[PDB]
Amino acid sequence: MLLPKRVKYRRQHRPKTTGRSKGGNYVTFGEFGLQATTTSWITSRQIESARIAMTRYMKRGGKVWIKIFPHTPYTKKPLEVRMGAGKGAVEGWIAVVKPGRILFEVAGVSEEVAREALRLASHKLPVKTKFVKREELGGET
Amino acid sequence: MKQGIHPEYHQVIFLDTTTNFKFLSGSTKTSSEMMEWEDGKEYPVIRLDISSDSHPFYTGRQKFAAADGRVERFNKKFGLKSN
Amino acid sequence: SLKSIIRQGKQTRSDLKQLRKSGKVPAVVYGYGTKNVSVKVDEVEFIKVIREVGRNGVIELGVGSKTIKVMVADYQFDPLKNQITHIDFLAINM
Amino acid sequence: KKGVSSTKNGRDSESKRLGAKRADGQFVTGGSILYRQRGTKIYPGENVGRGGDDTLFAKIDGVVKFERKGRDKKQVSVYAVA
Amino acid sequence: KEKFNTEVTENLMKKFNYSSVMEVPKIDKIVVNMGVGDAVQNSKVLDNAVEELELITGQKPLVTKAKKSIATFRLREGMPIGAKVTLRGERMYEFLDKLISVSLPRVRDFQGVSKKAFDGRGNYTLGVKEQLIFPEIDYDKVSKVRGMDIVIVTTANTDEEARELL
Amino acid sequence: MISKIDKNKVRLKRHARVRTNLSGTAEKPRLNVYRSNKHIYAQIIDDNKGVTLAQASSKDSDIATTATKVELATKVGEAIAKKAADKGIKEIVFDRGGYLYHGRVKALAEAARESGLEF
RNA sequence: UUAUUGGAGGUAGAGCACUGUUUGGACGAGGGGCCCCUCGGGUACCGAAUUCAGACAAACUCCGAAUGCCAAUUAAUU
RNA sequence: GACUGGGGCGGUCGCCUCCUAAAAGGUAACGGAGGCGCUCAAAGGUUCCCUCAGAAUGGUUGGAAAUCAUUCAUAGAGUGU
RNA sequence: UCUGGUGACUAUAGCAAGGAGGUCACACCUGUUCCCAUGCCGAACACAGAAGUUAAGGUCUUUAGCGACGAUGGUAGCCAACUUACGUUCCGCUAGAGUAGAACGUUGCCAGGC
Ligand SMILES: [Mg+2]
């Protein structure tokens, strides 16, 4: 529907990626963060909505980041066509999420309000989730 | 030094102070400070104005020219008027 | 400073996932004292030992002969499972 | 629907069959090619001559041997059949 | 001339506690230069004037950077020179150039490393050869060099060869 | 700041550039030329042997040169030929280091042909 | 076919050193107005300057596996 | 006239480089990006010589764009196309 | 193995910084009559000299700040096989990168002086 998050293309058509597996990508900025866990990938529209939520329920300002950005398009072509001919026009952008990325992170608040806003996010995304504290990476050198 | 792209010069009398040589050099006739500088690769004799001692610039600060009578004068004038 | 240990055989085929499942843990220690060692260790008493001395404190790792003082370097944590793998020690200088 | 309306990019049969054509430890005859390439993806050494498309061959019989020179760029060098 | 060089040769060792004559600066290049945003005929007179001041031809490089917005590309340009060993040391004496309003002797430091120069202007005269037969007057850039690591030994150099500082 | 760098290095570039054309060490021995300000050296050498077969140094044996002269170069250029008679080898290639073939180097070579060693 | 040695390339993977994308900081090189001054102050956004950390790629790679492929005056089986 | 995700209209029909191409090669699609249907009497050959873009600062032509000027600059330039 | 010329070696050689020395090496260096030469210029190249000097170049000593090397361990991936349709899992080969440790202020050949 809406695609605010965008960039210079460099190219407008691309073979997809479809996810298999990974871990990692701990928290580095804030304290509290959301961990995606499971089967899907994403468009930007979704992320925007989640940001609306996470900005409202936190008054007192309260800081947010998005560690990821969609670097990839999502093509989908005219309605009720026969297959065959050249790959279709643009409709979307994509930020793939294996199990282990950390989409949303916050700090400036307590442990609770974070957790609420993150519930109110994970209902508004495909992926199952998990709540995390920044206490440890798996490497510090 | 190529031969066909190189000009030359002439003109005229050497000096009085050193031996009576001209060493492919100048002869510089000035008025305020009157050094007959035999120091110039190209044309003498040169009816010039400065020796670099004339103006208070190359040598340095000097008395050379007032530049003074004006200010002071007008000042005293206006002063005595109201006085 | 007190850790009960088994000594590892260094060819412990990918079924060592059993060890990690048992709460046991692999690790190594090196630096100034000796050349290289592979060990086992419990996770439980290790997370005790973190708070006990601190991150970079001086543990006396277990052998059976002389314990070696160490200043724990590194570990490779994994999310989605909430635990540690392959701790890294360091036999310090004096 | 069908036809409408596009490129047709695609110029898809474009082949020249490059690569390598001998191997180490291989007796070889004079005039024989070892290795096609472009630029100098491999340099020549001894007993070798190059051509007007950066091909490589052996001016003389022997045994093929590739080598390293400067941590990036290799070279090929026949050495004498005993 | 070099007669002064024998004096400053002493002054700059009095002043800076070196341990060697060899650590002293020494007479090095001049470079003249000119230029135009565009020219068609004047180049003949560029060479004319510069060849009249200096006793040898200046040369005509090109603008080689792709410009298509100030003029076309590779319009003729320039008259640089390398003036040297003794034509050089004679040239530094030729400095007599007050024309009318040279009351600004330009203390301010030409390149921050050891090159301090009296970059200047005009063709009326250079304190030498008043011509007064012109199409036009043109700025005549300069550089000047002493192998050193600081502008202050240099300012001491051209000052001890009696430059006006401020 | 500015510095006329040592001329050995640009010489070195000019030395290895010609060898890339080829050296000839494995055809017949190569003769080289170093050029100090005060005097001149020379050697012949071949590979893979790595064996230096000739040397002819003016100041290193016959001291007190004193002036770098073209003629003195000719002496040394003969002397390697005599020093090569014992081997008699053969019609050698002549390396130019990174130097011009103008003389005095050209004089060394010219008076090296004077002896019985050809190019 | 297997074992043993050697060998060409640059996928998976990993990564930011080029290409290009990107987030938040540090930011200073400096500006734009609204306004003061009236010579300067410039008070949100910024380019690039330089960098801390974290990311992305069939048509980016400082790197780089398993497999396969090419030969062996080599050996066993067939 | 053939292809042709029925056929038709549309589009293409030969050649060069890449990617898809699965670490040799080869390997299709109405898959994704670009071109070619020439030019040179020197831009060829050969012997010599040299090393650039960018950046910093001072200076007439002041987008710090024009040439200068050194320093830093491992190829970021240029390579008929 | 003190110096120097020329070769080989994956930059473990380097790069940055500082300390020391020269008339035996080399260099700066004085100069341009000749050789010759600079698109302007003896700056460069070249020829003739050796007035001055260790400043620079270059050589030696030391530094691990930069860059290159860099294991061992365990991880991702994957060849074979079993289950399974699971953005699969378990088992057996193999074995990265990144990274820590550590390594590193070169090593040898030939001639000629010594
Ligand atoms: Mg990948």
* In chain F, where the domains are located: 21-110
Residue E62, Cβ density class (10 Å: 0-12 exposed, 13-18 middle, ≥19 buried): exposed
Which positions in chain B touch E129 (Cβ < 8 Å)?
Answer: 42-43
Which phi-psi region, left, alpha or beta, contains residue A46 (left: φ > 0; alpha: ψ -120 to 50)? alpha
Question: Is B74 an interface residue toward E (CB < 8 Å)?
Answer: no
Which positions in chain B touch E165 (Cβ < 8 Å)?
Answer: none
| CA distance linking residue D56 with residue D49, whole number of Å | 6
| CA distance linking residue C92 with residue D68, whole number of Å | 40
Question: Is A135 an interface residue toward C (CB < 8 Å)?
Answer: no
Task: Find out whether the peptide bond into B66 is cis, omega within 30 degrees of 0.
Answer: no
Q: Which of residues 22-41 of D have CB within 7 Å of strand H?
A: 38
Q: How far is the CA of B37 from the C1' of H16 (A)?
A: 76
CB atoms closer than 10 angstroms to residue C71: 15
Q: Which H or E element spans position A95?
A: strand A90-97
* Distance between C68 CA and the closest CA of chain A, angstroms: 22
**Inter-residue contact A98 to A42 (CB < 8 Å):** no
Residue F64 Cβ < 7 Å to strand H: no
| CA distance linking residue A6 with residue F112, whole number of Å | 77
**Inter-residue contact E105 to E165 (CB < 8 Å):** yes
Tell me the resolution in Å. 3.8
**What are the structure tokens assigned to C42, written together?**
């419990």
| CA distance linking residue F13 with residue E59, whole number of Å | 30
User: Closest residue of A to D7, CA-based?
Assistant: A86
Q: How far is CA C28 from the centre of its chain?
A: 6
| CA distance linking residue F8 with residue F2, whole number of Å | 18
| CA distance linking residue A129 with residue A97, whole number of Å | 11
- Nucleotide nearest the Cα atom of C9 (by C1'): I73
**Inter-residue contact F44 to F53 (CB < 8 Å):** yes
CB spacing of A23 vs C76 below 8 angstroms: no
Instruction: Look at residues E32, E31, E49, E37 and name the one whose alpha carbon lies nearest to residue E136.
Output: E49
The shortest CB-CB distance from E93 to any of B1, B39, B57 is to B39
Strand ranges inside E11-65, DSSP E:
30-33
Q: For residue C15, what is the DSSP state?
A: G
CB spacing of B57 vs E98 below 8 angstroms: yes
Amino acid letter for position E90: E
Chain I footprint positions (protein CB, under 7 Å): 5-7, 9-11, 24-32, 35-50, 52-58, 71-77, 87-94, 98-102, 109-113
Instruction: Look at residues C69, C72, C65, C77 and name the one whose alpha carbon lies nearest to residue C88.
Output: C72
Q: How far is the CA of D61 from the C1' of G77 (A)?
A: 35
Q: How far is the CA of C14 from the C1' of H69 (A)?
A: 68
| CA distance linking residue B81 with residue C1, whole number of Å | 101
**Inter-residue contact C39 to C29 (CB < 8 Å):** yes
| CA distance linking residue A47 with residue A67, whole number of Å | 11
- Which position has the token pair 């793998």? C85
Chain G footprint positions (protein CB, under 7 Å): 5-9, 13-14, 20-24, 53-59, 63, 70-73
| CA distance linking residue B60 with residue B45, whole number of Å | 27
Strand ranges inside E69-145, DSSP E:
81-83, 141-144
**What are the structure tokens assigned to A140, written together?**
């510090």
Contacts of F102 (CB under 8 A, 6+ apart): none
Instruction: Look at residues E92, E105, E86 and name the one whose alpha carbon lies nearest to residue E8.
Output: E92
| CA distance linking residue C18 with residue C39, whole number of Å | 15
**What are the structure tokens assigned to E127, written together?**
């304190």
| CA distance linking residue E96 with residue E5, whole number of Å | 18
Domain F21-110 carries which CATH code? 3.30.420.100
* Distance between C5 CA and the closest CA of chain A, angstroms: 23
CB spacing of E90 vs B50 below 8 angstroms: no
Contacts of C32 (CB under 8 A, 6+ apart): C91, C92, C93
| CA distance linking residue B33 with residue F98, whole number of Å | 57
Question: Is B41 an interface residue toward E (CB < 8 Å)?
Answer: yes
The shortest CB-CB distance from A86 to any of D1, D2, D6 is to D6
**Inter-residue contact C59 to C1 (CB < 8 Å):** yes
User: Closest residue of A to C85, CA-based?
Assistant: A138
Contacts 24+ apart (CB under 8 A), B23-32: B30/B54
